Structures are given as C-alpha cells and as structure tokens.
Design a protein around this ligand. Sequence first.
Ligand SMILES: CCCN1C[C@@H](CNc2ncnc3[nH]c4cc(F)ccc4c23)CC1=O
Ligand SMILES: [Cl-]
Length: 167
Amino acid sequence: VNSFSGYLKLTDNVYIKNADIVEEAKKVKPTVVVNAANVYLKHGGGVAGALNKATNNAMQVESDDYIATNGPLKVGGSCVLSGHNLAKHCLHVVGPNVNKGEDIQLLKSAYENFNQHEVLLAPLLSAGIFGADPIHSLRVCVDTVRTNVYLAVFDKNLYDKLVSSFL
Ligand SMILES: CCCN1C[C@@H](CNc2ncnc3[nH]c4cc(F)ccc4c23)CC1=O
Ligand SMILES: [Cl-]
C-alpha cells in the first residue's frame, strides 16, 4: 500500500491521474519524482520549468553543478539528484525531442530508467513541449516500465483521451 490517491489503474503496474505533477509531488512527497529533462538540465519550461520553479530554483542550481562536473546527459539517459521540497529524489530523464528530429525509438530507452526505482511519480516523457504524441508515450511506458509508476497528466482533455483510448 502507498499514499497515491485517486489514481485510475491502467495495468498491473501503471496508474494515471489528472493532476499537475508539481502539485501531486507537493502532496505525496514520493521517494522519486521524474523530471522531463533535457540533456543540459536547463529547466526552463514544461514539467522541468514548473518543478524547478516549485523548488525556488534550487533544482537549477544543483543541476548546473552537476553539468559542470559531469557534462551533458545522453538522450535516453538519466541522473538521480535531490528532490528538494518535492520528493526524496528527482530522476531527471531525457526523452527524445521530436521537434528537434530526435530518434523516437529513444523513448523506450528513456523509460527503461524507471525500472531502477520501485515506485515513481512521473510525467509522460517526450510529450508536451517535447513534441511526441502523448498516447504513444503512454503506450511505451506501459510496454517498458515494470516497476510501479503513477503518471500525472496536467491537461484534462488529454487525461480523458488517454484513458478512453487505452484498452
Ligand atoms: C497541453 C498538454 C499538457 N501536457 C503535456 C504533458 C507533460 N506536461 C505536464 N505533465 C504533468 N504535469 C505537468 N505539470 C506542468 C506544469 C507546467 F507548468 C507545464 C507542464 C506541466 C506538466 C502532459 C500534459 O498534460
Ligand atoms: Cl509540457
């Protein structure tokens, strides 16, 4: 039993809720919140800009030190950093950016990072401002992630369409 409330069960291990991931993180304080990161950990907008804003820019400060030490992530890759006031940890995961022509096949590699964590609160990787079809992102999540994932979807119409078109 965990504290995730009001989720609609999609599969054995995948659950979904109409919620802003930022507000959901503040309420639940999960062990792991996933950020929809880019390779430079520049948290300007989307999930990343919103999470970072909720940390009062502490996520960005930490991220800049990470990049100065380690260099950029790979598309499809991830790193674990602090969750600040939102979660114990933040798993920064880089899905491909379709607007920049990045390989959509890398979306599966991106979701594989979730399997290193038993339970996660997460957005739909590569969706939103990253340019991919959210219905496809949900499908890849279900067919790749084996650990327990709680997906927060910001947009109500999108949440409704994601649920309705699933089985
Ligand atoms: C029109 C479609 C909106 N999108 C794009 C996809 C990813 N975005 C997010 N996913 C979950 N929580 C979120 N909080 C946010 C706060 C923000 F300022 C900006 C973005 C998000 C966000 C799912 C979704 O609903
Ligand atoms: Cl977004």
